[PDB]
Design a protein around this motif. Structure first.
Motif, PDB file in Angstrom:
ATOM      1  N   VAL A   1     -31.378  45.041  82.844  1.00  0.00           N
ATOM      2  CA  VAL A   1     -31.495  45.681  81.511  1.00  0.00           C
ATOM      3  C   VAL A   1     -32.020  47.112  81.680  1.00  0.00           C
ATOM      4  CG1 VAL A   1     -32.813  45.508  79.341  1.00  0.00           C
ATOM      5  CG2 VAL A   1     -31.709  43.486  80.296  1.00  0.00           C
ATOM      6  N   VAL A   2     -32.911  47.353  82.631  1.00  0.00           N
ATOM      7  CA  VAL A   2     -33.554  48.680  82.858  1.00  0.00           C
ATOM      8  C   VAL A   2     -33.442  49.047  84.343  1.00  0.00           C
ATOM      9  CG1 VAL A   2     -35.117  48.435  80.869  1.00  0.00           C
ATOM     10  CG2 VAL A   2     -35.912  47.701  83.096  1.00  0.00           C
ATOM     11  N   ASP A   3     -32.832  50.203  84.649  1.00  0.00           N
ATOM     12  CA  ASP A   3     -32.859  50.721  86.040  1.00  0.00           C
ATOM     13  C   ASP A   3     -34.173  51.494  86.190  1.00  0.00           C
ATOM     14  OD1 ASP A   3     -32.750  51.812  88.567  1.00  0.00           O
ATOM     15  OD2 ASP A   3     -30.580  51.752  88.680  1.00  0.00           O
ATOM     16  N   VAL A   4     -35.186  50.841  86.746  1.00  0.00           N
ATOM     17  CA  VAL A   4     -36.555  51.419  86.871  1.00  0.00           C
ATOM     18  C   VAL A   4     -36.577  52.448  88.013  1.00  0.00           C
ATOM     19  CG1 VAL A   4     -37.658  49.394  85.834  1.00  0.00           C
ATOM     20  CG2 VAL A   4     -37.373  49.499  88.324  1.00  0.00           C
ATOM     21  N   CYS A   5     -35.507  52.565  88.805  1.00  0.00           N
ATOM     22  CA  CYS A   5     -35.337  53.652  89.805  1.00  0.00           C
ATOM     23  C   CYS A   5     -34.906  54.951  89.105  1.00  0.00           C
ATOM     24  CB  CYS A   5     -34.358  53.272  90.910  1.00  0.00           C
ATOM     25  SG  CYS A   5     -34.982  51.994  92.031  1.00  0.00           S
TER      26      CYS A   5
END
Ligand SMILES: CCO[C@H]1CCN(Cc2c(OC)cc(C)c3[nH]ccc23)[C@H](c2ccc(C(=O)O)cc2)C1
Length: 287
Positions: free
Chosen positions: A244-248
């Motif tokens: 859901v979220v690309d935290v990179c």
């Protein structure tokens, strides 16, 4: 083989010797790197979306044990049901159902301190790894590994041959519905009328801040094993598929919707007929 066991207190590939690093040969945005798992002397398990659909075998390089050397890829086997374009009609631009693939290596791996197979579900290796009786069925292995609960699990992220172990919880009890419905926070899935169309029975769900603050995956973790650790043995239960979220790229967004920041993994108990067929000659002893 003795699967899912470390082989001194070494670091990185000494602690996670089943990890495989995949690099896209002609990279672009969203198509740079993946991970995988050594599952036998000839096979690495990963996500299908890591390859080009045409000339799969020449679309990636793979390395094991933190080595610079690339292994010769003889064949890439996609799950037959995988089709990223399969639900374009329903406003689902990318569909990750059955997002699993096996890399058949031309040359036999030699196991050592940095190259070892992880255990797969519904094998004699897993029965032995979990110190279970020889009467153990595939259903019993499922009750032992994926109880209807929040399940302690882990995945590994890689950067310049350095591995980072990350503890997550699989939402497989009363949080399962909420975890799955949070697919709707994924950019491009936000307007799908019925979100159950994106999250099929093939998926396990991690992420969020209950019961603990789970780290999230990045695109580059795609194909990596989702692992259950019991009494110094490691059993693969899933393949990292999508987040859901690309935290990179987007740690701004996780901080906006931390309660709903989920990761989705192909449940290997849901692709067992394919695993058992493609790996039938690898001496893994499928039940
Ligand atoms: C068309 C529907 O796409 C969905 C599902 C795929 N993801 C990208 C993705 C993967 O793609 C295969 C694989 C892994 C392991 C991922 N881990 C985290 C993200 C992510 C999309 C996306 C794009 C941008 C951002 C952002 O800016 O935060 C977040 C999610 C939403």
């Amino acid at each position: 083989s003795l699967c899912g066991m470390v082989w001194r207190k070494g670091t990185d590939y000494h602690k996670q010797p089943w990890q495989a690093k995949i690099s896209v040969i002609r990279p672009s945005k969203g198509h740079e790197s993946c991970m995988g798992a050594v599952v036998s002397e000839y096979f690495v398990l990963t996500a299908a979306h890591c390859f080009t659909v045409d000339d799969k075998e020449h679309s990636i390089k793979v390395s094991v044990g933190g080595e610079k050397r690339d292994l010769e890829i003889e064949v890439v086997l996609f799950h037959p049901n995988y089709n990223i374009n399969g639900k374009k009609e329903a406003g689902i631009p990318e569909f990750y159902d059955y997002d699993v693939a096996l890399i058949k290596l031309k040359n036999k791996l030699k196991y050592g301190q940095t190259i070892r197979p992880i255990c797969l579900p519904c094998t004699e290796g897993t029965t032995r790894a979990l110190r279970l009786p020889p009467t153990t069925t595939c259903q019993q292995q499922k009750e032992e590994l994926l109880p209807a609960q929040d399940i302690k699990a882990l995945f590994v992220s890689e950067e310049e041959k350095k591995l980072t172990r990350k503890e997550v919880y699989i939402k497989n009890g009363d949080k399962k519905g909420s975890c799955e419905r949070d697919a709707q926070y994924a950019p491009g899935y936000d307007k799908v009328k019925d979100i159950s169309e994106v999250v099929t029975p093939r998926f396990l769900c991690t992420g969020g801040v209950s019961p603990y603050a789970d780290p999230n995956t990045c695109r580059g973790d795609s194909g990596g094993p989702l692992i259950v650790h019991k009494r110094s043995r490691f059993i693969q239960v899933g393949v990292i598929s999508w987040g859901v979220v690309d935290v990179c790229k987007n740690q701004k967004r996780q901080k906006q919707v931390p309660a709903h920041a989920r990761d989705f993994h192909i449940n290997l108990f849901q692709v067992l007929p394919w695993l058992k067929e493609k790996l039938q000659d690898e001496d893994l002893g499928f039940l």
